[PDB]
Amino acid sequence: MSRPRILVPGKINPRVLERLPEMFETVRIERADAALVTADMRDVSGIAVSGKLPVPLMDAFPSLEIVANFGVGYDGVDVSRAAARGIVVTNTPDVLTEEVADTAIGLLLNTLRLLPQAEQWLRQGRWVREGAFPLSPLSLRGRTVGLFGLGRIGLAIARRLEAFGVSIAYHTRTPREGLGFTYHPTLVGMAEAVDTLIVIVPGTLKAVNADVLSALGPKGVLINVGRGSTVDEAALVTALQNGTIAGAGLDVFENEPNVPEALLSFPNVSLLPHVASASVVTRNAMSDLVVDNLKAWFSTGEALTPVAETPFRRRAIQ
């Protein structure tokens, strides 16, 4: 049994490790580091990876055909270099869409209604000793929501928001035919028109800058759920400090896991440690898609979810 050999560098969801033996021999190295590649490993034809895949590691495998990335985001893979070598890169879209949309709505409600702070009030004994938690100055009722980015996650968020009875707008570079939402050709224009901005664009130039936050306005609320941040964190802190905007909810940050100290001090801010897809069920589905991409490639010659930059079918082997 000469089964294809798949490298796994460093940590990965254990479900990937569990399922690879269905078709593959797994080659483990402790870190994503070309120094750890031995001569025997040079027949490796696939990689399964979560996070950074340095180019020297990728280029240590002359027979490499496919990189199966864990996550919808694949920033850690040099896709231009992969494309140049005819290497297919796959990601995990679709299976996490609904879970991410759920998290975004949860974060929005927690930011507006202060539910985590209400719970802390109760757990600190203050309901007993001091009385009712103060009324939340904000609410979802009567708000107008602007989506920066659409895609499948944006459509899923928009679908939820319609059912809460809020008006919905969106900004993308091109409008979507068919949708009954208001399209804004510019980000600043949309931020002007709405009081609630939800950032779902993947996110070096931070598009949500001082000008955008100022347009959002004094009743404005910013929600960021990304794979990276396109929010100018220093500009956000300044806006919150000065009352330029009314509140914010953030699941993603410029330099995770580090959150600037100033953001932790505001009473009108909700902070989450990048939990958008972090359920057992959804991370299991992401793991399954990594493995099923590899299985499709080696049993049929085409991947399930290849990225846009690598539209390749499997080549002949001599």
Residues within the interface to a copy of itself (CB under 8 A): 98-99, 102-103, 105-107, 109-110, 112-113, 115-116, 118-123, 127-128, 131-133, 135-142, 159-160, 162-165, 256-259, 264, 270-275, 278-283
Q: Which does 119 bind (CB under 5 to 8 A by kind): Cl ion, a copy of itself, Na ion, none?
A: a copy of itself
Go through 263-277 and write b for each residue having 16 or more CB atoms within 10 A of its CB, e for each that does not.
beeeebbbbbebebb
The reply, when asked if residue 251 is annotated as ligand binding, is yes
What is the rounded distance in angstroms from the CA atom of residue 134 to the CA atom of residue 120? 12
Catalytic residue chosen out of the listed positions 98, 274, 309, 314: 274
Our measurement of the distance from residue 15's CA atom to the centroid of its chain's CA atoms, rounded to an integer in Å, reads 20
The minimum distance between CB 209 and a copy of itself, in angstroms, equals 25
At residue 233, what is the residue type? E
- Between residues 143 and 184, which has the closer beta carbon with respect to a copy of itself? 143
Question: With CB under 5 A as the contact rule, which of the stretches 28-36, 74-82, 247-255, 276-284 interacts with Cl ion?
Answer: 276-284
The reply, when asked if residue 274 is annotated as ligand binding, is yes
Residue showing the smallest CB distance to Na ion in the complex: 217
The minimum distance between CB 50 and Cl ion, in angstroms, equals 7
227 catalytic? Reply is yes
Binding residue (CB under 5 A) for Cl ion from 5, 171, 283, 295: 283
The dihedral sign for the CA sequence 179, 182, 186, 187: negative
Binding residue (CB under 5 A) for Na ion from 54, 76, 151, 217: 217
258: β partners: 255
Starting at the edge strand found earlier in the chain, the sheet holding 88-90 runs 25-29, 5-9, 46-49, 66-69, 88-90
Binders of Na ion among residues 15 to 44 (CB under 5 A) are none
What is the rounded distance in angstroms from the CA atom of residue 213 to the CA atom of residue 209? 6
192 catalytic? Reply is no
The minimum distance between CB 306 and Cl ion, in angstroms, equals 22
Q: Are 306 and 312 in contact (CB under 8 A)?
A: yes
